[PDB]
Amino acid sequence: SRSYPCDEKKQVIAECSNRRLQEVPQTVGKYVTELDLSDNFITHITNESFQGLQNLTKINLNHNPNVQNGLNITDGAFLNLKNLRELLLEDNQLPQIPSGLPESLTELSLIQNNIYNITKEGISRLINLKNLYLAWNCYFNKVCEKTNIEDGVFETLTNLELLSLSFNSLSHVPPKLPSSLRKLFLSNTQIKYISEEDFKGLINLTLLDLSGNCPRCFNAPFPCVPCDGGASINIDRFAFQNLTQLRYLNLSSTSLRKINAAWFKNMPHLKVLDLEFNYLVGEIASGAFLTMLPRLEILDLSFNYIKGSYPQHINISRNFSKLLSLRALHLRGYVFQELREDDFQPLMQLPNLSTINLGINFIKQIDFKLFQNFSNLEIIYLSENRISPLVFEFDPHSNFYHFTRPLIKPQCAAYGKALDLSLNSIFFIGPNQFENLPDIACLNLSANSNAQVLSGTEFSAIPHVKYLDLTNNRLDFDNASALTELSDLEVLDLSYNSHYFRIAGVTHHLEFIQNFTNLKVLNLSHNNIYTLTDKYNLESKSLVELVFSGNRLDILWNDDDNRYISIFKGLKNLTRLDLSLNRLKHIPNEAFLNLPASLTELHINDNMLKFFNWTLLQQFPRLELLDLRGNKLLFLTDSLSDFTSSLRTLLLSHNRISHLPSGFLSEVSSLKHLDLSSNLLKTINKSALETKTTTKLSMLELHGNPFECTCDIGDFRRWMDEHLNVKIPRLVDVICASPGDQRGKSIVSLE
Amino acid sequence: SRSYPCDEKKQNDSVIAECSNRRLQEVPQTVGKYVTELDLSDNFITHITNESFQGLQNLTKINLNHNPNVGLNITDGAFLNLKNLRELLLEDNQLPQIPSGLPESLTELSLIQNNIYNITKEGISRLINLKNLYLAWNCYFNKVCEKTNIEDGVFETLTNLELLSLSFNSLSHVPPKLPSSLRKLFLSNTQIKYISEEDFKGLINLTLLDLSGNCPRCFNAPFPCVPCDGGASINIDRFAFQNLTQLRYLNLSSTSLRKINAAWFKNMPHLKVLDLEFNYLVGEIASGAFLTMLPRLEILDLSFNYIKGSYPQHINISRNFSKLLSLRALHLRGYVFQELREDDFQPLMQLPNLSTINLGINFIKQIDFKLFQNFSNLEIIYLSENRISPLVTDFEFDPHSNFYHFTRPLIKPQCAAYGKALDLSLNSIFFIGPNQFENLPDIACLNLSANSNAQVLSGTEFSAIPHVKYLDLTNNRLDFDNASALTELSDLEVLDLSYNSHYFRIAGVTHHLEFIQNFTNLKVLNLSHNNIYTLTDKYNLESKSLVELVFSGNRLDILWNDDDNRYISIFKGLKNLTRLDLSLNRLKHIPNEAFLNLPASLTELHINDNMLKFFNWTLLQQFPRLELLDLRGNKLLFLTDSLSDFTSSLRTLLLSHNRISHLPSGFLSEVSSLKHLDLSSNLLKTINKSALETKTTTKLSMLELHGNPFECTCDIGDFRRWMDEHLNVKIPRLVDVICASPGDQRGKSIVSLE
Ligand SMILES: *[C@@H]1O[C@H](CO)[C@@H](O[C@@H]2O[C@H](CO)[C@@H](O[C@@H]3O[C@H](CO)[C@@H](O)[C@H](O[C@H]4O[C@H](CO)[C@@H](O)[C@H](O)[C@@H]4O)[C@@H]3O)[C@H](O)[C@H]2NC(C)=O)[C@H](O)[C@H]1NC(C)=O
Ligand SMILES: *[C@@H]1O[C@H](CO)[C@@H](O[C@@H]2O[C@H](CO)[C@@H](O[C@@H]3O[C@H](CO)[C@@H](O)[C@H](O)[C@@H]3O)[C@H](O)[C@H]2NC(C)=O)[C@H](O)[C@H]1NC(C)=O
Ligand SMILES: *[C@@H]1O[C@H](CO)[C@@H](O[C@@H]2O[C@H](CO)[C@@H](O[C@@H]3O[C@H](CO)[C@@H](O)[C@H](O)[C@@H]3O)[C@H](O)[C@H]2NC(C)=O)[C@H](O)[C@H]1NC(C)=O
Ligand SMILES: *[C@@H]1O[C@H](CO)[C@@H](O[C@@H]2O[C@H](CO)[C@@H](O)[C@H](O)[C@H]2NC(C)=O)[C@H](O)[C@H]1NC(C)=O
Ligand SMILES: *[C@@H]1O[C@H](CO)[C@@H](O[C@@H]2O[C@H](CO)[C@@H](O)[C@H](O)[C@H]2NC(C)=O)[C@H](O)[C@H]1NC(C)=O
Ligand SMILES: CCCCc1nc2c(N)nc3ccccc3c2o1
Ligand SMILES: CCCCc1nc2c(N)nc3ccccc3c2o1
Ligand SMILES: *[C@@H]1O[C@H](CO)[C@@H](O)[C@H](O)[C@H]1NC(C)=O
Ligand SMILES: *[C@@H]1O[C@H](CO)[C@@H](O)[C@H](O)[C@H]1NC(C)=O
Ligand SMILES: *[C@@H]1O[C@H](CO)[C@@H](O)[C@H](O)[C@H]1NC(C)=O
Ligand SMILES: *[C@@H]1O[C@H](CO)[C@@H](O)[C@H](O)[C@H]1NC(C)=O
Ligand SMILES: *[C@@H]1O[C@H](CO)[C@@H](O)[C@H](O)[C@H]1NC(C)=O
Ligand SMILES: *[C@@H]1O[C@H](CO)[C@@H](O)[C@H](O)[C@H]1NC(C)=O
Ligand SMILES: *[C@@H]1O[C@H](CO)[C@@H](O)[C@H](O)[C@H]1NC(C)=O
Ligand SMILES: *[C@@H]1O[C@H](CO)[C@@H](O)[C@H](O)[C@H]1NC(C)=O
Ligand SMILES: *[C@@H]1O[C@H](CO)[C@@H](O)[C@H](O)[C@H]1NC(C)=O
Ligand SMILES: *[C@@H]1O[C@H](CO)[C@@H](O)[C@H](O)[C@H]1NC(C)=O
Ligand SMILES: *[C@@H]1O[C@H](CO)[C@@H](O)[C@H](O)[C@H]1NC(C)=O
């Protein structure tokens, strides 16, 4: 059995999602324990749907049906599944909690439905529930009803550890919550008041999310309903008195102006405090609560700006010096003109403060030397400011109030201390710009509209930069000594610096590249490179990877010009080369033969190639991956094994191949992965299948070929049957084009 | 009938068969006998014989350029029998020789871009009627080729020849015995180092001479370039042009000139256009005796005469520029200088007709702007690509274009049409301060594109030039945080804010587009590629005057998210709008109420290049003026069967690149207004009779169907017969209206099935 329609996988999971399925297939293996049927067109679940699949411990029916209208699940449809632990039913337009769910359930997700009634009948039998998600049923301008929570509905769920009720109209915290709760999410629930009773008994709670209740609505990116008068949430003095185990508290966008220090009296473990989108400028200056948090590691005070206010200075209370455990401080969107060394004195003896984030404050100048006086900053994040020369659209499973991606690309941060000055106005780097900074290893200058001629001295005060990002500037590469002060540079990103490269009449100089002794990775992408001055060749003894996408090799290698015929030959250590998006119609033979013999990976995808000289792979004895996707190729050589014994992956997707030559599936013993996706194949011929021996072939992609499903396809179908070790992904997309009665169906589905 | 494979055009005198770029392997035997011009360019034709055009004696013009695409073999005399052949284009055919036995009727012959190295009497000297002969670009750069041999006197018998183009061939000397009927002589890039008194002594009718690129200036060349020994100058004898009294055009670009002999111009009283780009003329520009000899000159191009590595404070223009009384345009790109002062341009200031001054690409850091007012009448002040800051076919080189510069207008004609133009694009005007625009003329057309401007415009910045009518602010970083922005510009008709994403992208900063309603005369607004998905307080765009809104490249998918009502009327307040562009907004579906709030005034609505799966046809009932609906590049499956119930205005419906697999019976019944229906690149297997059928006949004039996977069984018969009974409906590109199935038909046109 080659399984269909699902792909089976044993790290036993049937991946069956996004396959245009109309019903639960009756072709699922009986050894399957986890079934992913998300994103199909399934409209009915009955007690017949999964009979003879009782090993199932997990079912995902999210996002069904898509497109061309709700999911209809009968009473007790799942009841017979004795082992069902986890049921995901998100985005199914369910009007109610389905009835008669199995008591074995420990995890149930009903996120993004139309469920306005939470009943004993739905839920109170489900004694084994540990995590229950009912979020995003009624929010924003959706037409929906206030949520009715049957009194005591949650009381019998004495194993429940996580309950998520966010983005529903609740009005108050429900009573009779089980004391087993660890995590309680009540974001955006229209609760204006927290009483002493609401969480009095939840002694095991480690996370509480009360965000977005009484929101700050000015300039909201969503329909936002403030409390009367834009008032603050109202939280009783003793509301958190028993929450001794709280580690995470989210009070983002609760319109707070005042924080009651006493709220933290009994929270000796509190680790992450989110206070973004409030009105806390005054508390930041004078916060008594900061005195109550000596184990706090992450404090987010972002977007507490006063509307219309652009103060000279940020005002940080001396009490910040009590945050002895603080690791990250987020101060985006406070809005201020100038950062002086004195303004941050309270932060300067915190031993573990690693990250300071001052993104999006419209800061016009910074006294940079202040950063050295900190104990140990490793991320100095200043992106999106005004620093100039010195002289359903919300993911319900993510954080709603900010992105959670790293501030600094991990590959750069991995080198050491990081200074991110991206998206500023440092248009010219002058002699003292970088004076008195720490030993920066990772420097981001992307998008500073820098148009200068770097000349070998600009980075002299931080000469150990290992990863330099200069993307999206207007750099004028007119000096052979550029960047050469950076002896230890390993990664250099010059992508999107077209501005001068595109003008023929100005001089262009890339000779500095050869100076670096440790340069491993160079990205020259999207620079429109088509002409250089005097020195035509790129050279480096160390470089391993060159990204040359989005340039004009079609010009450089024009048949009437010899000058660039060795452009990459001097990159003597290169193993990875990217020549995508260079508008190539053909590569002269001599040009191809002058690519480095060291290559293991060569991409030439998304050009316009009409021919490819296969014989020339004889000069590339280490070549493992050749990527020719997105071209106009028609001809495959019929003696590939004469030209390579190294090639493992050949990517030929989105070309115009109509004929596979004799024994091509078995031509190259080393070939593991052949991608023939989206070409013009009508069949695969017997001679194409002829093998002298066996082959290393593990994966063959064929989806989007216009197959002719006559009896001519028989041979390949029988081949598929007898080579079950060759994976063919996406069989639902390996489709008959002709004739009319077969059109649209998988080739596997053919009598 | 309906012609195939070519498209025919009944033009004037002419009837033209457009037959190019059709993958043809043979000259087709199906060309109409009334055809006078045949364009076969860009096909896979390999052989021309005396049978190729047998049935086609009316042919006056044949284009065989660029054949075969992926050399062309022409038998001796293949064209001889074509008694009326006037024009033969044989460019880019890898010909090794001039074809033999060409008809004597020829008046126009192009052999541009071949491998022809011998120009013989036998090829050419019988062709007595030739008026234009093009032999350019046969041996140039690092092509493998040989020096051109021109048989002595080969051109002498061509006594009606007016244009001869020999550029981009290795010639070494001007050929002798040229016919005196010559008007235009092109000898660019021909490796001629010396011009003698004899070379053009008899060419008394010459109006153009091109000697560019002989002894070229090669520093930083964008092509393989071979200087004369020592990088010496072309050597032109004092009397080389003494008989050239009719010359209007002289191109001496890239001839390594340092010194210009005034006497060269003594007998050239009509000279109008002088190209001197890519020389070493900084010294002549400061002194230039030759400027005294050119009082009828209108265009002078001195671009890229920079001294290598030199960055002087000032440009030095001789006082002799004041003698160029007829001068209209002065091009001074690439001289390279830091500052332009008012004194530096005094010699130019009383020239009555000097309309255009071009200072592009000089790395200029400051300009004393007041100087431009003291000119008599500048209309184009071109300062693009400097350092101005706040005030305190396959061919690399198109052989049919100018090689030394682009020929496009300096200023977009739509902007220039309004009046005086100041182009400050691609500079460093990052902040517009209070006096930036002091002392300027009455600018009507203002380009500030790509100045990395990040400021909050606030209603006073353009106070000193308040009659700007066309404002280009594209590709900046503008922070639209003030409702009075640009409102000082009362007469503004066209405003381009494209590519100012920078702050629109950030949810947490405020965004304000309210200023738009203030303009009384605003007609065209372009907000493209701004990533607009959230505004502050005022969610709606309003204008009583605006006729055209370009909103492509924003996030209407977000603005019109089903859980948000706030932007449901975003465009309704554009009460005068007729053209709306919603392309590239990632839309999967448009809420019905949102669609219905688009202005009732629309005549043209584009929603192409989204991801639409649904389109509610019934809503075209509220758009009684709608003439063009463009839905190309979406994922639509369903067409309504009762389109005539919902519109009587629609003339063009563009549905290309969708997933339509069925034309409903009877789509098009009673929809009389529709002229142009584009169903190319969909998933059609056939068209049924009743799908096209109409009782009251229709205005249908164009139906596109190429790139559909047609099933060429007998099920296609009905459409084929329909095609034959509606010859007034054009179906273009019939070679691309192809059978997908079954195997024996696959690849063939549907019109080609018995
Ligand atoms: C208020 O603040 C609290 C933190 O104090 C915040 O709690 C965090 O919420 C996010 C939002 O869901 C949780 O993040 C998810 O965690 C689960 C559990 O481990 C993951 O499965 C999620 O996985 C990601 O990748 C998956 C791949 O399968 C995807 O399926 C999915 O999209 C996700 O990308 C995801 O990381 C997070 O764990 C909690 N924090 C804690 C400690 O529990 C809350 O969101 C904030 N409130 C608002 C309204 O933003
Ligand atoms: C310029 O090119 C460089 C080099 O290719 C780009 O950086 C590289 O980007 C890739 C992915 O595009 C990173 O690879 C990824 O790494 C992750 C985690 O290790 C892995 O999960 C992915 O499958 C993939 O391997 C690669 O590490 C990264 N390299 C470096 C040195 O940072 C860069 O993105 C390009 N610049 C621009 C503007 O595109
Ligand atoms: C911003 O949007 C405006 C308005 O659509 C764009 O300018 C307009 O560009 C089109 C070309 O796409 C011009 O129409 C063309 O005019 C010529 C000459 O008459 C005609 O030959 C073409 O078939 C077509 O009609 C239109 O005139 C022009 N309107 C102006 C300038 O007012 C503008 O280009 C967009 N900006 C960017 C950066 O895309
Ligand atoms: C340098 O700063 C830029 C600009 O902030 C970072 O670019 C963003 O990075 C991610 C790639 O992971 C994208 O999803 C965003 O679109 C980028 N934004 C823009 C405007 O480009 C970049 O990654 C930073 N570089 C490093 C090494 O951290
Ligand atoms: C203002 O200047 C910009 C930049 O010079 C112009 O953009 C050019 O437009 C031409 C013709 O439309 C394009 O082919 C070029 O690619 C553009 N150049 C660049 C760098 O983008 C724009 O046309 C000018 N605006 C006006 C009104 O003339
Ligand atoms: C018209 C430009 C001639 C050659 C040239 N290339 C450059 C170049 N790339 N940068 C320059 C910066 C300042 C001054 C002159 C520059 C220059 O000159
Ligand atoms: C954190 C952003 C808060 C709201 C805001 N939007 C903008 C905005 N768009 N521009 C600003 C310019 C200067 C100072 C504050 C600005 C501002 O503040
Ligand atoms: C700082 O971090 C280190 C471990 O990463 C730790 O041992 C020490 O306890 C922390 N200091 C404080 C003051 O919390
Ligand atoms: C690069 O710049 C430095 C001055 O910054 C200069 O000394 C050196 O000559 C420059 N290199 C070249 C080739 O001009
Ligand atoms: C850069 O490399 C070149 C040539 O290899 C050498 O002449 C130059 O001095 C080098 N300079 C530095 C600072 O690395
Ligand atoms: C070549 O690359 C390898 C892997 O990065 C590295 O070990 C070696 O140091 C490089 N060689 C040279 C000569 O720099
Ligand atoms: C492939 O390469 C060499 C030239 O280096 C040549 O001998 C062989 O004919 C080539 N194939 C094609 C189609 O050019
Ligand atoms: C073509 O030329 C040859 C003379 O070589 C003659 O035999 C033949 O009939 C000619 N064909 C036509 C169609 O004129
Ligand atoms: C200036 O141009 C006008 C209009 O073309 C023309 O009549 C006049 O002769 C020109 N003046 C000079 C000095 O050439
Ligand atoms: C716009 O900016 C100007 C600065 O001149 C300021 O006076 C005005 O109040 C601002 N208007 C708004 C609505 O912010
Ligand atoms: C702009 O538009 C509205 C017109 O209703 C008005 O309130 C506002 O004051 C106008 N502003 C200026 C600066 O003209
Ligand atoms: C409506 O647009 C046209 C431009 O075609 C103009 O004549 C008319 O004046 C505009 N109406 C108003 C009220 O601005
Ligand atoms: C189209 O919108 C119309 C308004 O005429 C509404 O009656 C109809 O329900 C719509 N169809 C769909 C599928 O939304």
UniProtKB/Swiss-Prot annotation, chain B:
UniProt GO molecular function: DNA binding; double-stranded RNA binding; identical protein binding; pattern recognition receptor activity; RNA binding; signaling receptor activity; single-stranded RNA binding
BP terms from Gene Ontology: canonical NF-kappaB signal transduction; cellular response to mechanical stimulus; defense response to virus; immunoglobulin mediated immune response; inflammatory response; innate immune response; negative regulation of interleukin-12 production; positive regulation of canonical NF-kappaB signal transduction
Keyword annotations of the record: Disease variant, Disulfide bond, Endosome, Glycoprotein, Immunity, Inflammatory response, Innate immunity, Leucine-rich repeat, Membrane, Receptor, Repeat, Signal, Transmembrane, Transmembrane helix, Ubl conjugation
Distribution of this protein across tissues and organs: Expressed in myeloid dendritic cells, monocytes, and monocyte-derived dendritic cells.
Phenotype upon changing Y306A: Abolishes activation of NF-kappa-B
Subcellular location: Endosome membrane
Outcome of mutating F430L: In IMD98; gain-of-function variant resulting in increased NF-kappa-B activation measured in a reporter assay
Ranges for domain LRRCT: 708-754
Glycosylation: residue positions: 12, 50, 58, 73, 118, 205, 243, 251, 316, 320, 353, 374, 447, 482, 518, 526, 576, 616, 688
Disease field: Immunodeficiency 98 with autoinflammation, X-linked: An X-linked disorder characterized by onset of recurrent infections associated with lymphoproliferation and autoinflammation in the first decade of life. Mostly males are affected; carrier females may have mild symptoms. Features include mouth ulcers, fever, poor early growth, hepatosplenomegaly, lymphadenopathy, polyarthritis, and non-infectious enteritis.
Record-stated family: Belongs to the Toll-like receptor family.
Protein name: Toll-like receptor 8
Organism: Homo sapiens (Human)
